[model samples]
Target: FVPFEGIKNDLKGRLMCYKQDWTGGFKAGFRILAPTTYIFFASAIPVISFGEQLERSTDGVLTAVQTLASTAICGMIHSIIGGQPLLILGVAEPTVIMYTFMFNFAKARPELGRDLFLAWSGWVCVWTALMLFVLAICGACSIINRFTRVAGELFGLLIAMLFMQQAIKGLVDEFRIPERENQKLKEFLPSWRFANGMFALVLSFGLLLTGLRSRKARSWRYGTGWLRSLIADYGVPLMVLVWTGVSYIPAGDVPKGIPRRLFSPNPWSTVVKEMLDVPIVYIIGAFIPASMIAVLYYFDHSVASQLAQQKEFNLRKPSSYHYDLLLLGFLTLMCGLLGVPPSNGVIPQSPMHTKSLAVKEQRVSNLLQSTMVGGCVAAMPILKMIPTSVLWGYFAFMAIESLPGNQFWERILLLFTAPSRRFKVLEDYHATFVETVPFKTIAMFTLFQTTYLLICFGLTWIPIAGVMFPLMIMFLIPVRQYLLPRFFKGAHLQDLDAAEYEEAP
Candidate 1:
């Protein structure tokens, strides 16, 4: 279907629900509020993190203000009008990378002027939105279905590693700080407090283990169902609080450098002025970057949308890719006009939203009761317990779980296992592929996925990484279409290339 028809159906669904099903939605909203509050803080911290990166790169041109504003606007509008209400939207790493690249490029070419450069970027954003609109109208979002779980799992692995690396670095840096004001910087290295770093590491891992234990205990019949549910639901927050209290025992105060405010609001007028000051020449030159960004957004949005479609969530309505892309196009355009960071479907947060609201079916007195349960409330106080490093650790754990089939880490396990015992493994898609497909074909497929994954991973380190990312992912489409078919026969290619092999919901 065309984008128009897809959006028409989306509007129809919302209107029909507004008129006939508002009460059910209202009730669900109320039920979800408590859990969502936990999710809100979980999601919000990342927004600030991304903003900090942007501010550092741009020399204060952009900050948490625009980032938070974009997230709030895009999220609210998409929830109300788009197809996938459960899909959370925000300023993700790709968007930040793109902005930082542009900032660095402008700095290198000072004659281009930063204001004009941003204006050009804004124009690029406008063009990118237009490109998305055209592609959606042309039904190009069907490419989303062509990506296998390999790509999704690899992307999730990349994000998880990013979080873990940052957490480790932050924790180490916390202890590396100078102990005394008069201490010489060079002399402080030998005096660094190893105990503080050790404590942070222990606490971070402790929280992760506690979270895993909570999930394990979910099916236990030791206590009331509500108690099990509470532990399962609030496990991370509860552990965070416990660790926070522990930190204060010896120090007698909260950890240093916790953020005091959520967002620093800036008026839209200043943002508009910044955009309008740019020269027209830069605006025209924006088309090239716009094209690159459009490709990136397409892959990023598509993969994230597919990930959010897990059958376990059991969403009542099917996703409309074209409809969602159409809305995202306008949303990005609005972001440019308002001088806010452009938002897209984030990997971890979107699926976390789905998981937070998911309900499993169970037999209870033959009444078919909903398994959805309440979680923590008045939970803001618990945020004080979470050290910044521990929060990063929490994010890394969240990223690890976001993977489909949990294949990346499972594959890592294969190397440590003896070949004889490996035969008993049947978890990851790769293992299943080995079971079902010819060894040569599986080998070839693994080579292609690994090469692509390695290239994408390497790209994260270099300048212009953002521009290369979407293009690298887009590289898979053609390989599946022409390269695989040329090497393997029809039957083997069909099994390997098709998304049917993916374990995604």
Candidate 2:
């Protein structure tokens, strides 16, 4: 009853509160839907791509149907029942990599076969779900508090770097021309293509700067309230739309990449039917790896969810860490049963969703009020201005905006300022505790986390990088439990580990 009662009470408040009509909820949802759709579509790319890759690797034993169905069904169900409804759940990189590893592992073991491997993977998902349920029921989410801002901020930075890299890769890949039979090898490194790439690069930076400027325009004291707010809110999306229209100028034979298409096709019943039989030993064998995957899921999901619930969003609703875990656990099991690759709370999408739904709040007397005012066509000659670059320019924009209040970036900024002229440090748990922790201790902590992050970043380059991440995250627990305590006083340690501020009312 200890953890169950606590879970019940938390759910009671959240579910019952939904019955009331909150001011601006409808308006906010309406304003957010357009960009949210684009963001979601962009997010789904990795899922489908990975799904196709897995399908090929497994010789079609695993289908992309799992990816499509989970995106629609799990995403919808999780929204209604999840702790954070605004968080859009779908296939994530870690989940995909784990499955890919399982496929390869199965391939190497002819005795097990691919079919049984599928079954083993499903059983592992079941085990993972069971573990998640146990954790949620026992209040394992509390252990996450031991993870300081050092870890959270570092993770956020990793995600931001990922987004920027993806954006650049997507833009740069467009300039590659296929070699002709008569063409010499020396022609591959043409200066014209380099110039084109640079032009695209310039435009990408230009659009991001414009988007940032539009965000600041909200408080410029010049335009009507709604007008400025509208520009600020829809800045990136609007910029993409505008540049797309303008790219038509002086049109020529512009490079068109592959024709656009949906992420995956739906084939629901067949996907589920494939997960029928397996040896008991294989299922048992799954326990260890499933546990590893679950640990990664917990870290990624918890961090992203916590960041989504930051006070800066001014959300009127409370967050449910345990409840969401329970939901995701069930979803993971369901996906496993259906032979769908399981997914978790993705870093980029969750924060993007929260920011998209965020409405500005104002105080009147003693009450808070909501002031809620609030994608792609042809890809031909539009490529002249590098429409792909513009698209990814918006991608870069979302990545930057997601990390506004994170202490990692804040500390990095402070390093550039003259100490005497720097902005006053705010007093709270982590910040205050940071001041108390010896400079050497803090430096050591920073270096430790940085080293871990750099390792994870490096791992991303390899084919099997996904499996390596969970092990890295698992390594953090002992560091927090054993290593950190050695450097901090009991009181200082508590403050360093605990969240400094509660969610704003």
Candidate 3:
């Protein structure tokens, strides 16, 4: 940032950039914490819980090794390439759900089981790398952006509603299972209890309010804040630490809690016999998980870079993005060697960096912070000595906090017309029952979904452009006939970039 020309009017440019520079450190910090501490841990919880059922013999060492290796690799790749610096990436919930479906589908086939699981992990790495390579080559970073904000908003709403339903169901199960002492209820209730539920609810509420309050305060200041406002900026972590302390101190036994152990040395020689398990299903699993991880990585990196540019930080340019991906891969491979999970730019941290305590805006601060974190990671002896209770609740709450972001799959529901919002005519497919018009909303919805499905399908079959052209014509037919005149009659798509075709008399 250039020297301040005696704070007169045009200060907006300088202050905002300084703020962004400040928060970048925090963004890096949470990148490590959010994914590894919370998302990865929660994801591996099931492996620990149902350890005996999945394996012929249960060994804590084996379970830990498998979980750590898979998660560390996942985290490493994600941290390196995601666009938003602090947007923590973990094992995608969607991947988990899809894999769970596949696993259950083949659960009875014992011969295909053990091999399938191992192959799945290996394939995940393959698929993810391929997806990243494709993106890097083609620069399809805008693919997700193509759906349009409106489409995303609708999908987001759908996910939110479905999530609310799940949360309510979870709440009911939390209460009902304990009361009835039913076998299924007991099996489920151990992990998700009333206490966990309430804590989760409280944490979600607190974070929501914190985000809103901070944004509002910034808006009131015309989105300009002080250079070193880390407290105001990184409020999420502050709130987390505060609440974590509150939760930890009450649990007396945890006052002197056990510390995290060191990463075990890899035993590749011993596990060589487990090689026959590599297959297509595992490869498919690899494809989806890796794809998701790559997307997250790209997003994290781009977001951080963009925010840095906005703050006039003379760091890196976006045009070198492909080279950055290669750099990220190197970074990931390096971290993997050390048993450290991958790190990425965190979402919460990104905005916070635009808001941090030391905002001179040279942009070297971000790179420096990342290096320091690497040092902390390499110095594992310090990790062992840290006060145990201090860190436990921090991650426990993070797991609780991540529940809100877990509703990404409701988009699968939209492949059907009845549930999708664009179609308002089919009655049967409609969610609400107000005025049950015979074949109204449901019928229209069905037709729309069918059309969309066909379009999506045809993209894979016939020449994509050929399918799209006919589809466009079909879409405009109704508008050409009637809906067009409601705004500007007899307008064709070809004639409609600006001032309508044949204006009203």
Candidate 4:
């Protein structure tokens, strides 16, 4: 019944244990080493990829340097002050769409165009930050408690599919013959497309298989426990280096057909102070676009935290939703001032951060992983040697590893399996959902979700409408809670989306 119960409790709880937060992180000692290596490589590659995207999308207004700075700063602050260090903060899709739209929004206006784009985006971030501050202080996050497992699992499943889709989509593109207006085709016995496709197939499949195999390294037939465990933890990332070295192996002039080495752009100082020049009308009017971003931030951040804090991770510290949101308010404002896109709790990374640690909870790996990203800004000579295809392989590696953990993904598997074989084939079957709900009901629900996923995924293709897709994700909560119940029984719906540790579907 307190006015700011979430704020009060979250802050008080985190601060009281603030001393242990740091100590516990180091107390694990060797345990933190493996996860730090894995999480750093996993999260860092995306930081660079998203950085390149924003740079291109915004016409270099916000470069990867700012993205790196933004990610590094937000992550360090979140670890020190925020409640849940396990919730990794980084660039995400919605923020990417919002920033891209901000560029378009400014470009279309005669009075305020690309010259004032960064400023315009910053002002919108300011408004978004203020809105989040309001939400956090008012304890609005408590309402998030009502969103069930179905929504969480669906959101995570979408993230996993995006990872796999992008990787597979990339491998498919590798097979296409090179197109250049000025180029004369170098006709050879083994074509460039064939050579390049073979390289990617080997790298991606090798990375996936190597990672899966190394997962058993923890109990390998011959090795010290920690040594094997370290190999187990770094299977994919180490192979990333292995494949990076493999790229140097020449198949004649064939290397030109494949991807270029990862480029680390020298960061320029771009200022967002000019955004203040945006017409008075648009400055205050920025609130409308800002509100869309605020919703995107809230949904992704909340969903990521829920998945990271699931019973499976075995986290003991209390979650600080309000504290984290409030802290995000400060980070967003900082990003606006610095002329960079803001980072928040991002998926795949958060759950991966927790899973990689599997040891007792600690915040050290989070801080160290982000610190590594920051350190790269000054000296990244080694990045120039890394192969782009190898990173794509690692992308598929992470995505493929994540699929089995998701219940929504598990349900999707049912479509291919016949009813007669399901009992024997399915693993750790959801006793609550599998036994209680009929196959027809599960199929119908999965169909609706698949339909929703496609519609939402399809929106990304549209130039302007895609940015509005967050509203669709937000709409899902109400749909699952209210609309879905119309056909299915409430008892079974509860079973299908149960949240209690014991009642998990």
Q: Which stretches of model 2 miss by more than 4 angstroms?
A: 1-69, 82-88, 91-124, 142-144, 175-203, 246-252, 255-270, 276-289, 303-320, 336-343, 346-391, 412-441, 460-466, 489-498, 501-505
The full ranking of all candidates by lDDT, starting with the best, is 4, 1, 2, 3
Please list the C-alpha lDDT of all candidates, in the order they appear: 0.62, 0.61, 0.36, 0.74
lDDT of 4: 0.74
- Model 3: per-residue lDDT, tens digit, 223-254? 34652244344454455455455544535542
Off by over 4 Å in 4: 23-34, 55-63, 104-114, 168-202, 212-224, 251-259, 268-270, 281-285, 310-317, 351-363, 426-431, 500-505
TM-score between candidate 3 and the true structure: 0.43
Over the stretch 166-240, how does candidate 1's per-residue lDDT look in tens digits? 556566655665222344533234433455566667777777777767765678778888888778767766676
**Against the true structure, candidate 2 has what lDDT?**
0.61
Pairs of residues clashing in candidate 1: 309-505, 310-505, 311-505
TM-score winner: 4
Candidate 4 residue-pair clash tally: 1
Candidate 2 lDDT, tens digit per residue, 1-505? 3677547766976775553423334435445445545455445434444454455446666544556556656765665455566565667655765777777777777767766776778888999999999888988886776666556667677767766766676566545643222234332345545645665676678788988898787888888998887786666657666655555442454333221112223342123444445656776878877897788778877877876677777777666788888888998898888767787777666666656545421111001100110011122122223355565676587668757767556545544445565234432333554455554554555566667888988886665444566777667667777887787667655644556532211
User: Among these predicted structures, which one has the highest lDDT?
Assistant: 4
TM-score of each: 0.77, 0.67, 0.43, 0.85
Candidate 3 Cα errors over 4 Å, as ranges? 1-118, 138-230, 248-276, 280-318, 325-505
Clashing pairs in 2: none
Model 1 global lDDT (CA atoms, 0 to 1): 0.62
